[PDB]
Every structure is written in C-alpha cells, then in structure tokens.
Design an enzyme around this catalytic site. Structure first.
Site, short mmCIF file in Angstrom:
data_model
loop_
_atom_site.label_atom_id
_atom_site.label_comp_id
_atom_site.label_asym_id
_atom_site.label_seq_id
_atom_site.Cartn_x
_atom_site.Cartn_y
_atom_site.Cartn_z
N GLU A 128 -1.99 -8.83 2.93
CA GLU A 128 -1.87 -9.98 3.54
C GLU A 128 -2.85 -11.13 3.26
O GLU A 128 -2.46 -12.22 3.02
CB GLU A 128 -1.64 -9.95 5.08
CG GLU A 128 -0.57 -8.83 5.54
CD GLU A 128 0.78 -9.20 5.18
OE1 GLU A 128 0.88 -10.21 4.37
OE2 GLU A 128 1.48 -8.44 5.79
N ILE B 108 0.75 -1.17 0.08
CA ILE B 108 -0.05 0.13 0.04
C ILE B 108 1.08 1.10 -0.09
O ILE B 108 1.97 1.31 0.88
CB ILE B 108 -1.11 -0.08 1.22
CG1 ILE B 108 -1.97 -1.17 1.06
CG2 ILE B 108 -1.65 1.34 1.38
CD1 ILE B 108 -2.75 -1.12 2.39
N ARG C 110 -2.12 -12.42 -0.29
CA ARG C 110 -0.83 -13.45 -0.15
C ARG C 110 -1.00 -14.70 0.38
O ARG C 110 -0.59 -15.91 -0.23
CB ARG C 110 0.23 -12.85 0.56
CG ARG C 110 0.76 -11.65 -0.19
CD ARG C 110 1.40 -10.68 0.89
NE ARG C 110 2.04 -9.18 0.45
CZ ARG C 110 2.35 -8.36 1.04
NH1 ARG C 110 2.15 -8.48 2.35
NH2 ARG C 110 2.79 -7.12 0.45
#
Length: 247
Positions: A161, A72, A164
């Site tokens: 996260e 980000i 991922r």
C-alpha cells in the site's frame, strides 16, 4: 532487484528511501501522467522480487512480492517459508525460497477480507507505524500463528500500500516512535487502487475523464468523488497503476 528496510535506527527519510527503492524494483514500459504503469504479466523468473525486513532486534524476514501488482505471496524466516493459501502463492512457491527446507501454507489467502476474518480485526482496528512494523516482523519471524494475520496486514500496508500511495507512505513513515490507527482516507485508497488504476488508463484515451467515478474519503470523513486526472489523488498521491490487463 532485491530491496530492503532496516528498523534499527530507522527515520522518516530512511523509510522514504526504502519505499522509493521498492517502487524502482517494479518494472514498467510506460507511464500515464507520470505514473508508472505496471507490467501486464511477467515470466516466473522475472515476476518476483524480495523485500528484506529487519526489526529492532536485528531479526530479518524476506517477503516475496509479485512485481506486476505488488502483492505479497509469502515470506521466509530462516529455513522456513510461508505461503498464502491461494493459487498465486502456490505458483510463487515454485520460484522463491526454494532452498528453505520447511514450507508452511498459511491458513488464509492474502486478501484483506480473508485476513481480517482470520485476525478477527479489520484494518482500522490495527495500529500502523514503524513500531507496528517492527512488532509485525517479530510475530512473523517466530510465526506466532494467532497474531500472524494482523501482522501480515501491517506488512502489506507498510509495503504494498505504501508503494502504491505516497500519502500512505507519508503517514506510516512519519510514525517513527509511535503508532496510529489508519483513517478511512487510507483504507479508502487501499480499497480503490484497482478502480483508480483502471479509470486513469481509460482517461488517457478519454480526454482525461474517468469512465466511472471513484469515491474516496478525505481526512474529514467526507466522500469525495473522483472523475478526472486533475484530482489530487492522481496528481500528487497515486504512485503506481495496476495494469488493466492484470486485474
């Protein structure tokens, strides 16, 4: 590809749909063991994508991410843009939210170390879950400075996260009406993305064997050493690989 997620009426399915769309907006030329390998780099005009987040009160912020690593760079709320205090963000500011007439430089970069210090809280002390995301959006929408750091940490884990790791996706998405404190199993995965990504790429030309082990923490708080692509985290968790060329 622009994507989005709406908290109003959100469900575990709709969050899964959003994460699925976020992963799809990330380009890749190849896959290793069916896991998309992110691009080594991209030209500024292709490097960024936007994540439009709407909280319960129907307030929306647009989050800018680097699609090569899902980082980000900052976000936008109305006519104001907010960028992390680091070279990455400064570079992204040249491509995103350029019509926002108010540009703010956050007092910290976007890595956990910096953010936890600014927040005075570490990730494990910060609740996650859809209701947590809603609240984080609110504090960022009105920029409640003293809570922005922790709120950004909620945003990162709820997007970056989650994209991922399918496990993190599951945990956050299941918490529809309540929140929870993240386990070391989650933090462990977050801290090991670069390492796992690197080792899996090496493995693809090293008989499926890691060059160096990666230690994770399971749900029982025990350390589990990963050494090959047969590990569960590789087969049924990791959903994106960071390119060896790109940290």
């Amino acid at each position: 590809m622009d994507v989005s997620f709406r908290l109003s009426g959100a469900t575990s399915s709709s969050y899964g749909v959003f994460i699925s769309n976020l992963r799809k907006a990330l380009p890749n030329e190849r896959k290793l063991y069916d896991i998309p390998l992110l691009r080594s780099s991209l030209p500024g005009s292709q490097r960024y994508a936007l994540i439009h987040l709407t909280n319960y009160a129907d307030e929306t912020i647009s989050v800018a991410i680097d699609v090569t690593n899902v980082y980000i760079m900052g976000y936008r709320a109305g006519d104001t843009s907010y960028f992390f205090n680091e070279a990455s963000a400064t570079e992204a500011a040249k491509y995103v939210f350029k019509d926002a007439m108010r540009k703010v430089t956050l007092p910290y970069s976007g890595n956990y170390e910096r953010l936890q210090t600014a927040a005075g809280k570490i990730r494990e002390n910060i609740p996650l879950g859809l209701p947590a995301l809603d609240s984080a959006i609110t504090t960022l929408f009105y920029y409640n400075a003293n809570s922005a750091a922790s709120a950004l940490m909620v945003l990162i884990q709820s997007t970056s996260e989650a994209a991922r790791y399918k496990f993190i996706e599951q945990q956050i998405g299941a918490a529809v009406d309540a929140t929870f404190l993240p386990s070391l199993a989650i933090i462990s995965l977050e801290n090991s993305w670069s390492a796992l990504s690197k080792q899996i790429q090496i493995a693809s030309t090293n008989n499926g064997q890691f060059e160096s082990p990666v230690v994770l923490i399971n749900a029982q708080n025990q350390r589990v050493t990963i050494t090959n692509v047969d590990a569960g985290v590789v087969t049924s968790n990791i959903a994106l690989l960071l390119n060896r060329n790109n940290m």
